[PDB]
Amino acid sequence: GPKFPRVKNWELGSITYDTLCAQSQQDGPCTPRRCLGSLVLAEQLLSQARDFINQYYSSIKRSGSQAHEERLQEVEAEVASTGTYHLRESELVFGAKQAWRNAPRCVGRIQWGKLQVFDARDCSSAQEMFTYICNHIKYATNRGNLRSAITVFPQRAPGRGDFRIWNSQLVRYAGYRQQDGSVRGDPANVEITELCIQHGWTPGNGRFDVLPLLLQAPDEAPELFVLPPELVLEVPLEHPTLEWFAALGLRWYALPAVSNMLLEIGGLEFSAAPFSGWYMSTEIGTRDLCDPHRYNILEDVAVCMDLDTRTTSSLWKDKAAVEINLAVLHSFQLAKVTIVDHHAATVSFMKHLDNEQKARGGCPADWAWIVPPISGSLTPVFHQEMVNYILSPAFRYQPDPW
Amino acid sequence: KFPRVKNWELGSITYDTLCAQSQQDGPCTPRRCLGSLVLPRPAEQLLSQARDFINQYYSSIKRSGSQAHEERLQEVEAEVASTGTYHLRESELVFGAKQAWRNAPRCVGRIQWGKLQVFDARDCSSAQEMFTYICNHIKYATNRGNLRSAITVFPQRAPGRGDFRIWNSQLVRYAGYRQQDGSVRGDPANVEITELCIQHGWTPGNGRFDVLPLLLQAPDEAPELFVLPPELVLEVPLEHPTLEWFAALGLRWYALPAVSNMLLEIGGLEFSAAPFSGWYMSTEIGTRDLCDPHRYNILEDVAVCMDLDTRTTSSLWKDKAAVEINLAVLHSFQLAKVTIVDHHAATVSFMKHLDNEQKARGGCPADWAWIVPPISGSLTPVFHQEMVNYILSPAFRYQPDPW
Ligand code: HEM
Ligand code: HEM
Ligand SMILES: Cc1cc(N)nc(C[C@H]2CNC[C@H]2OCCNCCc2cccc(F)c2)c1
Ligand SMILES: Cc1cc(N)nc(C[C@H]2CNC[C@H]2OCCNCCc2cccc(F)c2)c1
Ligand SMILES: C[C@H](O)[C@H](O)[C@H]1CNc2nc(N)[nH]c(=O)c2N1
Ligand SMILES: C[C@H](O)[C@H](O)[C@H]1CNc2nc(N)[nH]c(=O)c2N1
Ligand SMILES: [Zn+2]
Structure with a gap:
């Protein structure tokens, strides 16, 4: 066969080869000596930028066109004089969809083409972040008829503070450490709960108290914002x-709504770009x-x-x-x-695998995350071999900002 | 260079240093992980595998560097230098079989690794004798329902000649009869082996749970068919x-x-027929x-x-x-x-095994996808346990079907 990984489905006996993995420009944790697949966790900029711009122009079928070449030239002149560059609106939309498409741990990727992308790159304060996040939540929730959305705040800038949402999700429940050592509410959220209290939140004492948002604009202390309860379905x-x-x-x-991940697009890093689905x-x-x-x-x-x-x-x-x-x-x-x-969900993901095989020649997928935590082998994905690799644009973990 | 291994339920961290003993590459690279794939896509080599194994054996009996240790390394060196091969002493074979089990990344039952009955069948010269050995193994292992772990080791592969092989993938399995309407009666996993038994003179049943006969092969001979006495099959x-x-x-x-199609590798030697069973x-x-x-x-x-x-x-x-x-x-x-x-x-006992091996060897090769049960995954402690996967020797490996 071809010199690309051969991928088998053991339920159906069908075989594919993954050629998409050849496009990976970033190493994962595995080597020939050991697999670490189960672990949870200007010159450089320019090559990542060029690559992304090539991806964008391929996607609109204008690869090698004069508009493609002019955009390349414009990007390297920007980087030359400023050390960075900025994405066109449609490049950002393309990049955010692609980062979702590329996410190996997401079983929901059949929906990747349907993402409402909110451009919030003009945001300049914590208050305005709050407004944008509230609008995101309103749009996404849509009174129960949920719609996939992402809001993108300004990118990282050289020697200038990041925009950051401190909460790991936009909606999560408090966890309160009790006198007897136990926890009331969600034990996953003890740190963030105690940080909200330090910054002046009057805590509840229930098992399901919605946390406030701790929001940070460049080089300022984070500011506290309580979500109005009518917005939290x-x-x-x-x-x-x-x-x-x-x-x-x-x-x-x-x-x-995941709010602590970094969205990377062509070397640009959006440290605050919360996204949500269902x-x-x-x-x-x-x-x-x-x-x-x-x-x-x-x-x-x-x-x-x-x-x-x-x-x-x-x-x-x-x-x-x-x-x-x-x-x-x-x-x-x-x-x-x-x-x-x-x-x-897993049936739809198998369809997605088939789509992506035809569209791109493979699909990066992290088997341990795709297979559900109950009834694993009862779903078709359990019997499907998967190749895991890092493509860009991508969502990445980043350190907690405190 | 040594990976950090975290348990996410408990917050505890260990470091796997055992992985540095791995001499054999798996399917992953920095570009892409292939961990979910089921199957993998001369004197000086054998000698160093042999020496490493003999060093493991003498180490395990706390006699590292002794006279018996040196003289044994010389025996192996002398035999390989003259013949291109060597032979294990029975106690070495016993140590090697338990070690292959201990080293098996896809096995959740490894807390039992030290308790293994090893039958030496390396004096087998016919499919007939293979059958008697298998029958004794089954009787022993079954033990009227109080199951005992066992392995039987048939003669090693040799340069000039065909392998001793058991054609069955397990000693006990049910037939699969392909029907005219395209469906399968019995076990669909066993259609091909069932058809081979029939082609070699087996009179088939027509039920859903028909115990297959054994197709046993001595070197360079056609396989021979043996029906298991029904009284032996619990x-x-x-x-x-x-x-x-x-x-x-x-x-x-x-x-x-009772797995019967895997290859047992010890000290560079290969045992193409070596069926093993637990519960x-x-x-x-x-x-x-x-x-x-x-x-x-x-x-x-x-x-x-x-x-x-x-x-x-x-x-x-x-x-x-x-x-x-x-x-x-x-x-x-x-x-x-x-x-x-x-x-x-089983998963609770595997967590205990991981702790035991951490102290004993500095780690434990484990294949997370195979260890996590196929129902109720995250309801077991092993779901939340990071695991490092790698190939240590002695080892059990897959081998091609002999047909
Ligand atoms: C539309 C319905 C969606 C469903 C059903 C879904 C499902 C999932 C699930 C079950 C996970 C595993 C999470 C975990 O157990 O920690 C996951 C992860 C992920 N999802 Fe999706 N998702 C959806 C939409 C989205 C959207 C809109 C995006 C972004 C545009 C997205 C991006 C991601 C990313 C980056 C991860 C990986 C997080 C990590 O590495 O820990 N998903 N998704
Ligand atoms: C004593 C009780 C035992 C239990 C509960 C047990 C359990 C298991 C399980 C659940 C698997 C995964 C099987 C699959 O889904 O294909 C497995 C695989 C394996 N077991 Fe154990 N086992 C036991 C004894 C043994 C013994 C005695 C040996 C050999 C001396 C052994 C060697 C292996 C090997 C080599 C594999 C991997 C096979 C492969 O890679 O396909 N096990 N075991
Ligand atoms: C957009 C979207 C849709 C959906 N159905 N589901 C999601 C994942 C959310 C919800 N349910 C879990 C949370 O996932 C949070 C993102 N990943 C958390 C995993 C993790 C990271 C770092 C350290 C760890 F220990 C663990 C996102
Ligand atoms: C010794 C022992 C004890 C126990 N509880 N369980 C076992 C595994 C046996 C039983 N139940 C399944 C079988 O496992 C057989 C080995 N695994 C087959 C995986 C495979 C899939 C496709 C192609 C291949 F080449 C290989 C052994
Ligand atoms: C240790 C192991 O990698 C870890 O528990 C993973 C396994 N698979 C998962 N899969 C999903 N979807 N989400 C998770 O949090 C995890 N946790
Ligand atoms: C494709 C995937 O690797 C394959 O279905 C594996 C998954 N995990 C498994 N785990 C065990 N114990 N046994 C198996 O046969 C499998 N099958
Ligand atoms: Zn790997």
Whole structure:
């Protein structure tokens, strides 16, 4: 066969070769001696810029045209006299969509072409960031008919502070460290909760208190902004057949909006570019609610179901997890809030794999993140070999700003 | 250079230094990770592999650098220099087999690595003798349902000649009969091997759970067919603790998981036939064997029996049905008094193994995709555990099917 990785689907017996990986210009963590795939975590600028501009002109089918060459020349003159450059509006739209398309850990990529891109590169204060973020949340939420969106704030500048959203998501719940060492609310958010209190937030004392936004404009202390409650759509959790589930007082928010990632486009770095879609149900039902280091509700729910929690072989954990996941799907459906189950999501991702094979000759995908955290082998992606590599434009992790 | 390995449930960090002992490259590069791929795409070489292994052996018995150690290295050197090969002493073979198990990145059951019965069958000269050895292995391993880990090692590969091979991928598996209507009766994974048995003179059954005969091959000879005496093959009828109709599905599985198609590499020597067995983790049967779409694929049948809404994925009928099947497997083996481990118990014991190996060797090669169970992934501790994957020797490897 060809000298590119051969990729097999073990359910169907079908084979593809990935040629897209040859376009990767950035090393991952693996070597021939060891695989680290399971770990979670001017001259240079110009070559990344040229590459991105070539990508943009390919995408509009004007590669090698005089407009392509003039744009290249304009970019290197900008870099020559200023040390940086700036993207045209349509280049930014293309770049943000491409960064989503390129994200190996996202099972939702069948939607990549449908992204509302808000250009907020004229933002010049924390207050204005708040306005933009509120508008994003309003547009994205759309009273339950969720729409994928990203808002892009000004790029990093040489020896000048970054725009930063300190929250890891736009909507998340507080976690309060208790006197007895335990946590009330979401244990994932203890640090950010304590930082909001330092900066003058009067905290609640519930399990599901919406955090305020800590927003930072270049070279200034972060400023605190409470989201008006009418903007934060939430879903009370109930179960279709288990009547007591509603009595548990569980709830979750409708909008998953990642706010601490760096969007990189042609060497330019947007340190604040929060993006949002809609939930896949296992994110809430399995991870947020059942992780031992999160809300950890498995045992409480199994006790309500009268399961034998004293022994592993009753599969009490598996049974309670299924019902919690069902409650999430049912509650979001009842509230008319967009949500996708892990079966439909993974089916759509397989379609996406097929699309991308035809369009680009492959699709970078991180198998451990694509396969859902319950019922892995029951979904078609479990049986699909995947090649993981870094393409640009890309979303990247960045250090917490405190 | 040594990777940081973090557990995300607990916040704890270790460093894998064992990975520096790896002499054998896997499929990944800095450009792209190929970790999800199932299969991989002379004197001086053998001698250094041999020396390394002998050094491991004498080290393990705390006799590193002794007289016995030096004289043994000379024996190996003298034999390779004259013949191009050498032979292991039985105790070395025992150490090497356990080490290959210990080193196997895709095995969640490695807490048991030190407890392995090794049958030396390197004096085998016929398919007939292979059969007697396999039969003794099965009887020993099964032990009336109180399963004991075992390996039997047939003669090593030799430069001039064909391999000893077991054609079956497992000692015990069910036939798959391709039907006129294009469907498969029995196990679709075993259509090809079933057709080979028939072509070699097997009179086939026509059931869903027909135990295959063995096709055993001595060097450069046609394989020969041997039917396992039914009394040797322990099987478990599947029932459900609360759902009475489940027993009427007529479902069953065999007690003994026994891999027979992998190559055992020790000290540069290659054992092309070396079947090994332990006991089942229930998800192998309840989730993969019975529920895989390209296997028995019973999910939909079970869900309809449970009267679940199959018209829509969001009723989670697949998840619900899969749970009850796994429960049925667990209950049925426990009732039949046959050793089995559930995926929670197994993954908890694997975490303990990782801790043991950290202290003993400075790490543990592990393939995260294979260790995390196929249902209820993040509900097990291994989901939140980062893992480093690499090839240490002694090792079990895949080899081409002999046909
Ligand atoms: C439209 C519905 C969407 C669904 C169902 C979806 C689903 C997911 C899921 C399940 C993950 C794994 C997250 C985790 O477990 O930590 C993920 C990650 C990710 N998503 Fe999507 N997503 C959607 C939309 C979007 C959008 C609009 C963007 C940006 C334009 C995006 C970009 C990303 C990125 C960069 C990651 C990786 C984060 C990381 O590396 O930790 N997704 N997505
Ligand atoms: C004692 C109880 C044991 C349990 C519960 C157990 C469990 C498992 C499981 C669940 C797998 C993954 C299988 C798959 O999905 O294909 C596996 C693979 C493996 N096991 Fe263990 N095992 C046990 C004993 C043994 C023994 C005795 C040996 C050899 C001495 C062994 C060597 C291996 C090897 C080499 C693999 C990888 C096969 C491959 O790469 O396809 N295991 N084991
Ligand atoms: C846009 C979008 C849609 C969607 N359905 N889902 C998402 C991921 C959100 C929601 N549900 C989890 C959170 O993902 C947050 C991004 N990644 C977190 C993983 C991580 C990073 C660093 C250190 C760690 F330990 C872990 C985004
Ligand atoms: C010794 C032992 C104990 C245990 N519990 N479980 C086992 C694995 C056995 C049983 N249940 C599955 C089978 O695993 C067989 C090895 N894995 C096959 C993967 C494969 C897929 C496709 C092409 C290939 F070449 C290889 C062994
Ligand atoms: C250690 C392991 O890599 C880690 O727990 C990963 C596994 N797969 C995941 N997959 C998704 N989608 N999200 C996650 O947070 C994780 N966590
Ligand atoms: C493509 C993927 O690597 C393949 O389906 C693997 C995933 N993980 C697995 N894990 C185990 N234990 N057994 C398997 O057969 C597989 N299959
Ligand atoms: Zn890798």
